[PDB]
Amino acid sequence: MVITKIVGHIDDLSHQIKKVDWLEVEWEDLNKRILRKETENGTDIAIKLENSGTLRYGDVLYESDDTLIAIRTKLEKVYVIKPQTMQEMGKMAFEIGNRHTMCIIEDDEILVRYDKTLEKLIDEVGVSYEQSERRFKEPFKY
Amino acid sequence: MVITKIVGHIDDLSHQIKKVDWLEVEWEDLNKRILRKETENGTDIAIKLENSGTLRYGDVLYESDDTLIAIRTKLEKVYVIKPQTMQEMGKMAFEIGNRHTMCIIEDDEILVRYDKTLEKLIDEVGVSYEQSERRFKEPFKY
Ligand SMILES: [Zn+2]
């Protein structure tokens, strides 16, 4: 099916009553309005948004009586940088921006894709980080 | 006089007992080990450091019985960006680094030179800032 407009948004997944058939895309796909991929349950989806609205993690593409076809990003290896102070956050964020590395700044953490050549930078700045598996939940601005 | 090595450092200016004849330089000069300028009281100073040690604001170049010749940066117009949260700090710092703008991240503030085309960026990020006159007290790393 061809999707030209979003028809809803999942507020709180745990509270959703309908079955959710997810369309899992790449982080970069959230900044696109054109893409084609199959949902986890096998439905062919071609997103061709007829507007400039940016896709949001959790957006509903199609809704039937008992199912929601929604979009989210894939689970992937990431570095969860945890600055302990306003200064640590600023300095760490600055260095990341300076090397043009994609990231998400949520609350007091900096999410960046796993990148070996990046650890030497975090240590250099002296910020504590942890490796993990997460889904980027916001399209990268830029 | 030619200065090839630092001979002291001013801890706390208010507590210093000796007269301080300041050598006022540009922010960028703190990353140099070679420069020539006159002190406020008229002494010709040629800094030619015989080492890789970076100059520090407050470094003492020469000390006599009653006077200290020390270095500091000039007072200039700057923007004092004040992020209210860890997220504001990170996002603001990221954008600044992304456009390769020189800055100093001290505590919970971001010091950047006054730049008109930069206000639209701060507002875009939604961070509170204030215009002021300050001396950059740390050499810019990079
Ligand atoms: Zn660049």
From Swiss-Prot, chains A, B:
GO terms for biological process: protein folding; protein-containing complex assembly; urea metabolic process. Belongs to the UreE family. It comes from Sporosarcina pasteurii (Bacillus pasteurii). This is Urease accessory protein UreE. GO terms for molecular function: nickel cation binding; unfolded protein binding. Homodimer in diluted solutions, homotetramer in concentrated solutions and when bound to Ni(2+) or Zn(2+). The homodimer is thought to be the active form. InterPro entries: UreE, UreE_C_dom, UreE_N, UreE_N_sf. It is found in: Cytoplasm. Gene3D superfamilies: Urease metallochaperone UreE, N-terminal domain, UreE, C-terminal domain. SMART domains: UreE_N. Keywords: Chaperone, Cytoplasm, Metal-binding, Nickel, Nickel insertion, Zinc. Binds 1 Zn(2+) or 1 Ni(2+) ion per dimer or tetramer. It comes from the Bacteria. Ni(2+) binds at H100. Its cofactor is Zn(2+); Ni(2+). Involved in urease metallocenter assembly. Binds nickel. Probably functions as a nickel donor during metallocenter assembly. Pfam families: UreE_C, UreE_N. GO terms for cellular component: cytoplasm.
